[PDB]
Design a protein around this ligand. Structure first.
Ligand code: HEC
Length: 104
């Protein structure tokens, strides 16, 4: 995936509710810094749904690929109200951007 195409998708579709920077603020949704290799629902200082807390999978390329296609199907009862990214290549580009941006 292309990091530069990923940034653009992030700004257009995710930045409304999320920051990526170290120490960045919680908005509607949690700051995503350090996401990769962490379990679901682990950002300090954010109140998650029990569904997001208990899903019990590790965020990596494979799990983000499935989640971003249909967030409500993957985590039923999530309060992330977002339709998903249907195109595999848009998901790949976004995940490449997140993998860089969420550890600086
Ligand atoms: C608001 C309208 C949001 C948009 C647009 C996006 N997200 Fe979100 N996201 C939001 C909330 C309220 C939550 C918490 C959900 C809960 O049930 O508690 C989330 C959660 C995530 C997560 C999980 C984080 C974790 O620590 O487990 C991820 C990985 C995530 N969101 C990513 C994401 C991306 C990449 C977005 C654009 C494609 C996106 N979100 C949009 C709120 C909102």
């Amino acid at each position: 995936g292309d990091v530069e195409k990923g940034k653009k998708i992030f700004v257009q579709k995710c930045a409304q509710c999320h920051t990526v920077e170290k120490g960045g603020k919680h908005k509607t949704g949690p700051n995503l810094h350090g996401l990769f290799g962490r379990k679901t629902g682990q950002a300090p200082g954010f109140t998650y749904t029990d569904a997001n807390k208990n899903k019990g999978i590790t965020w990596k390329e494979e799990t983000l690929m499935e989640y971003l296609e249909n967030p409500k199907k993957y985590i039923p009862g999530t309060k992330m109200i977002f339709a998903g990214i249907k195109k595999k290549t848009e998901r790949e580009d976004l995940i490449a951007y997140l993998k860089k941006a969420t550890n600086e």
